[PDB]
Amino acid sequence: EDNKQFFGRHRWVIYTTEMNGKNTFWDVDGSMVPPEWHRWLHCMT
Amino acid sequence: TRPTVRPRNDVAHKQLSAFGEYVAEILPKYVQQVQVSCFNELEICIHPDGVIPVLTFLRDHSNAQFKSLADLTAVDIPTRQNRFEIVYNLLSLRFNSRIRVKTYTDELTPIESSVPVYKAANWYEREIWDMFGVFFANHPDLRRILTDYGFEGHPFRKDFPLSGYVELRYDDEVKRVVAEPVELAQEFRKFDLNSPWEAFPAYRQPPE
Amino acid sequence: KKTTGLVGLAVCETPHERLKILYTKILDVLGHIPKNAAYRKYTEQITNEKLSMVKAEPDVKKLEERLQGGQIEEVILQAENELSLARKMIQWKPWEPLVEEPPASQWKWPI
Amino acid sequence: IPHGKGGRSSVSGIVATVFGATGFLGRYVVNHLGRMGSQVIVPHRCEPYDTMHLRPMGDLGQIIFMDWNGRDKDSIRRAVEHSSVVINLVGREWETQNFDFEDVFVKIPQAIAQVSKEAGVEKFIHISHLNADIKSSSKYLRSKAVGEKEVRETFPEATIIKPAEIFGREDRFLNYFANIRWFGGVPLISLGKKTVKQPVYIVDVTKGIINAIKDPDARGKTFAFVGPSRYLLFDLVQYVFAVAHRIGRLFEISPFEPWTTRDKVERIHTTDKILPHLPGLEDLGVEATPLELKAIEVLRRHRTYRWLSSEIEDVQPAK
Amino acid sequence: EYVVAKLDDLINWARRSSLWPMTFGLACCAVEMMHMAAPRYDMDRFGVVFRASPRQSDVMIVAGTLTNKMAPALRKVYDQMPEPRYVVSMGSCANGGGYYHYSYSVVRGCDRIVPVDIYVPGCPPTAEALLYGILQLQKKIKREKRLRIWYR
Amino acid sequence: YRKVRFVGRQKEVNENFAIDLIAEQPVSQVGSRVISCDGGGGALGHPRVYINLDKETKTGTCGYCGLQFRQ
Amino acid sequence: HPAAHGVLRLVMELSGEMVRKCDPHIGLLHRGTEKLIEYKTYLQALPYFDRLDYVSMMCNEQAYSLAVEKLLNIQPPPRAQWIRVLFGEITRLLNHIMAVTTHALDIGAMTPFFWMFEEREKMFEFYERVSGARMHAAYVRPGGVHQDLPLGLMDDIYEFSKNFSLRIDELEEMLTNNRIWRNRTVDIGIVTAEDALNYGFSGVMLRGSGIQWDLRKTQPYDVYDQVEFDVPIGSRGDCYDRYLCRVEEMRQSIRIISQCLNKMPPGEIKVDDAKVSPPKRAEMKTSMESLIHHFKLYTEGYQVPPGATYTAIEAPKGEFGVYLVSDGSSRPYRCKIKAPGFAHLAGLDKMSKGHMLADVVAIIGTQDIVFGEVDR
Amino acid sequence: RFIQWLRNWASGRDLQAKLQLRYQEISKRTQPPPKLPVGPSHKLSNNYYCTRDGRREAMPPSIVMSSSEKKAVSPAPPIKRWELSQDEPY
Amino acid sequence: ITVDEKLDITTITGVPEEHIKTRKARIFVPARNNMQSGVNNTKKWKMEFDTRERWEN
Amino acid sequence: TYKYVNLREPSMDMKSVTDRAAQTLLWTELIRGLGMTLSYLFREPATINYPFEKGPLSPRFRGEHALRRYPSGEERCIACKLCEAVCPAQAITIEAEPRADGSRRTTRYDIDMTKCIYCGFCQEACPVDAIVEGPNFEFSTETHEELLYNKEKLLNNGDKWEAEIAANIQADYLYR
Amino acid sequence: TSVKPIFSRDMNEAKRRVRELYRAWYREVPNTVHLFQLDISVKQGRDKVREMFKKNAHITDPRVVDLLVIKGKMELEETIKVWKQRTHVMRFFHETEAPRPKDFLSKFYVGHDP
Ligand SMILES: NC(=O)c1ccc[n+]([C@@H]2O[C@H](COP(=O)([O-])OP(=O)(O)OC[C@H]3O[C@@H](n4cnc5c(N)ncnc54)[C@H](OP(=O)(O)O)[C@@H]3O)[C@@H](O)[C@H]2O)c1
Ligand code: SF4
Ligand code: SF4
């Protein structure tokens, strides 16, 4: 979470490797997130 | 009565009462009923022979200009012994007032078109032909607007069931895009919402 | 002035005597309509109150008040086309009594 | 069991299973089964994209896709378990550089005459050709006769079909001609002796099946498809140039899908108008279509407007 | 082999490096696509340039609502597109027609005309569930044309 | 006849059931005549209904509440 | 392609280079609208007015709710009127961003499209925070606003609307004193006569050419008399001086927003008498009389007395009128919509003759034609 | 810096109303639990239906229709003209 | 004028397809869903058509 | 009232014509106009980097559907038939049955995700507070045979999160 | 019958009007067969027209015949010009649609009383 010097691009995430049967790093679909950061990544609270 | 109830005024309820009193007094060949709407609007029933003159009386005058045609529409009504209902609507730009012209009709009886009086009703009259089948006489260009090239139902009337007859599809049997009989994948349930006890006592029909 | 307000009209040219011709141009026609109509009974009344205010007083601006047309070129056009109504008013006969009453149950709305 | 109109979105009882169904013959069948509406389980070999033009035929949940190699047993024993009929049209033209081509018409129609037969299917159907004869022709034309004979051992009642030669819309038979804009037009072989065969129209062969698919009582009674009116001449090749006025392959090109400097030049001129005691098309009614009505359509080269059609043939003799 | 199936790690990467969409902006899902070309969730320069001509495009995007009087003009335009063509329908009216599913003048579904790959649901999908839609289309490209000519 | 649509599709179905997950509740006891159950917390859950608990052998889970309620 | 992104097939028997005959074809998006409202109730058929334009969201449903309150004899409560103006005069900063950008994209200027939509996304944020959703919000009801707007939006409209007059100070330097765009638009499509009123036009392509009139200060809506502003007029009768209404109305809409933040009375939102509004969720959950008016107001609708009506508001390109015949029960009779595009586009055939073909694409952008609204 | 005043020699100069609100003066959240009152005749002993009556109003009053020195009265007094709005009318 | 009096029975055709001779209509007075007791549901003659098959999708 | 725009004559003297004839001929406009207003490229671009960064939303957002349940499970639905009577698009398809314990429940529950016009009329008609428009726009399946929802999809889709949903409704039930 | 007619008066101007437009359609069969690039035989297009006019010969009334004229007069706008893109014309020739039984015993196997 950035230094409060942005908005919209101030909550960036990183993916790593193979959540539940994926490739190394060359398949990131964006639906891998846990259903708790939906309350956070989308700036909803 | 209270808050959250519309306040009326007797000013416009008296002026629009008094104004259109003498639209039945000075053309009593055509006008056969005039009634005042409770929300300060005017309706005036006109025999379909007076389709052109009572517009033409209004169209230019010193006391009632009504130079803007806002809305031409049409309503169909079964059980009337004369089906449809043509409703004209005009705007007094000098005076800020409204008046509606309600002319009844039938299917086969033509109506003299209001093309020469207002050139606004060119497209408002090709349309009504497509949607009901009223044949407006001597129209300078009568055509097929808002429908496909294959409809023969005039669909906005009560005899055309909601989904059509001609549900379309594609096939590779040659190359074409071809019609079919209608084939739904759900019933379109028809609910029943008309509840008894006759909640409105003022508008009550005569007993018989 | 050079702008007549409403574009499509033109300042050409003379007020105060272009009008008073066109009122009395209609008054000759207004006498012809066979007098039992209420149409003559009102239309004679609206032109006389007009012209008695019109003829003949400066300014151009003062004629705009007390005769509630728009600007002066458009005040011409309120009376210019009432002539074109008037000669049509002889042709059909609004003053005759009523024809072809609808069949006694048509204007009864809640079915 | 059936219900309602058979226009679309009905049930119609049958649950087919149509193998192949990507080529010119197999595709046009499934179009008429995606109308009356039925679980037409179509499996395909190795083609995800090349079958995409097949999906607006099955309404919603009518068709279903599976992958299968063909030589392995259970890959064709998994789709044949829930079925009513199953028809076969698998095969190709020339021997490939991976397969063997011999038992592909012997073991592979038998690999789906395996426990498929046992599991409870009925009305299993194979195909034939009007020229496949065990006399010494050809490497493809015979060894189809092995498939006429060596696969007949299992399923002693099939109604194997024996259609005529086909002219159609996207075919290869007639289209092998008029694609010979080339350094010369060489006929086979500068002679008009036995030309021509019976070019039956592809809508009739796909109408014969769907009248046989609930006939009933057509099992074991093999059929042979009548052609047009009536025989034809060598004038055909002149008639093709009369009105013409002179999938999943690769990424750039497939370097070998050839015109086959082999048996293929004589795989079509061996005619053998076979037994007229076969029942075989009109009793599988009702269909009888000429050539001179449907000849304008599929022949299409660079004039594209002006045809001025008057070219015809008498019968020809031995009519 | 290892020689041939390596080559579709380029061609099936070249085919997904630059898609050129035609769009059919017909109704309200036109505008909520134009905000994706607006530089907030900027559509271009994440791989995929915006609109071109019907002769040059790869992957068309149907939006809006297909009536009867647009049904032949769709299928004609679908023909001119090249061989590696794909169809995406956005909008909840190219999925079975939103509402107006029961009124006479709507082709009920837009799969009944063309074969469509990725369905995206929502009255207007928020240009946020459409980048997730096309990033499903790039993940669809894991196919190969090798091991087809090299198997059979 | 119907089971071919999930050949190689794993047939995703529910795992827990609430057909009977009522019974693991320690059914509440009060020693009174009528009790309220706006169950699930205030301003959420089903509306407040008053149940008579005098008989064999429980309130009746309110009609809404599901949870076995008694004295 | 995109002359309105794939609609409007028109035939042009062009006289050499000039057009002199032009007759378009509509009906490529017809959908069967007015047939289909007869089979719904009043509250249930409300989100098919929101989809009747595209870009006006709260300007439609402002002229449906006001056309049903008349039939009911109910006024909205006082806070419910200063919400409708804060939205009904914030969609007039959306319908005028599009008419001055996509017009200038058909002509060929690239950036002011991108320069404004990057800024426009600060304002589709504001729908989501109040209603719940992105564009089509079912928010206005026939008894006022659905629910209250959250704690906020007055430190966020105020930060926004104090910095919009610089963004509209960019288009003045892009377009107005620009020469090439002035050359593309002067004295083009001059329909100015009283055939430009015989055709029954609504606003701009009126008042931008002559006749000063609009239905916001010659008729009332709401508590809307209590604001002050002026109505921009045009001098000559062409596109460049009906362009300049749309630039000038956006400056005057900032004045009606800044006058609206100061005046909102705290109070209720829904109409109180509960035969029209549903009650609170914390009210239908304790008392008994609240379900019978929550349940039965969702199986059947209201009961509205019979008799026709008509109305008109000032939609940001014209009018929006409803002729809503109600029979007397929960499902209405005919509901005829009046929208522009019947007036604004029947009067193109007069407007186009004499000029080039490349003048014709310059004409159409100034009427701000939005289809699905030619479904009138 | 040199890239700062180059933006001040071109297109005016703002530096305060930047396009992105990504910087400061951006509102974070809101704290309190909201409470909303119910005012217009919600209470008892006077506030009461049959005085509240938001419906049940009569039919449109018809005027004399089928089955006197009138001064030709207009529907309304005509529209008086407008001002010219002294902010910057030209 | 040209009012051309005569008498000929008005019958229209062309608009539906084949459902003229296949379907007999039915005019009835609806009668009071008996679980309640309000009689506003009466007082209007209606018509209603035949019912046909409803299979399962 | 009024306002007049583009109603002004030129000055037409000796001085200001050279002010205008410096414009047409030597371009005092069109460089001072738009060789400077454009560049002005020196601002920071505002691009959401989508697979990692995501955009702002609001706790009343509309999206994927769900069916909640009580503390320890009861399948909060009671099949009272209102969420199906005010769908404007007639998506919901409920068929109840008296379940064996005595409390009534659903058997089949079907929501099309294509006829779903995304009102929020199911969300607010429910008395027992069950069916909730949940805040996740994750979608984009590849077959029309899939977007038809059953009952036992929605519960799975409604118990993949309830930490997401119940944080939203507790913030927002105070208004409605 | 107190209603003015459309075009005709009584049975004679009408039944020369309907014979007028038949000579238009008989002329404008072999034009559209190449104006749309459709490949059938030209005698098919003439058979459909002489089929279509015999359909309506049960009329005993004027201004009903005149109503059918207006529909028949209108189609020569679209058909003689190019407004139907090859597909709205070919709907008169039901090539795709399966044959109906129209005999009693074949209905009884398939279909619950159509
Ligand atoms: N009755 C006639 O007049 C006639 C004429 C010519 C040929 N035939 C034969 O009758 C059938 C008609 O087929 P067609 O006209 O549509 O042409 P086709 O190109 O042979 O299509 C038949 C399908 O079989 C597939 N295929 C080839 N080898 C296969 C294998 N080992 N396993 C699985 N599939 C294989 C082919 O490619 P894919 O594997 O990619 O699917 C093709 O899709 C064929 O068997 C053909 O050889 C008949
Ligand atoms: S239903 Fe959806 S796709 Fe159709 S117009 Fe409305 S928002 Fe657009
Ligand atoms: S959520 Fe409410 S409306 Fe929907 S089925 Fe359950 S109880 Fe009925």
Ligand code: SF4
């Ligand atoms: S969002 Fe609206 S249309 Fe969709 S299922 Fe819920 S109530 Fe029905």
Ligand SMILES: [Zn+2]
């Ligand atoms: Zn409880």
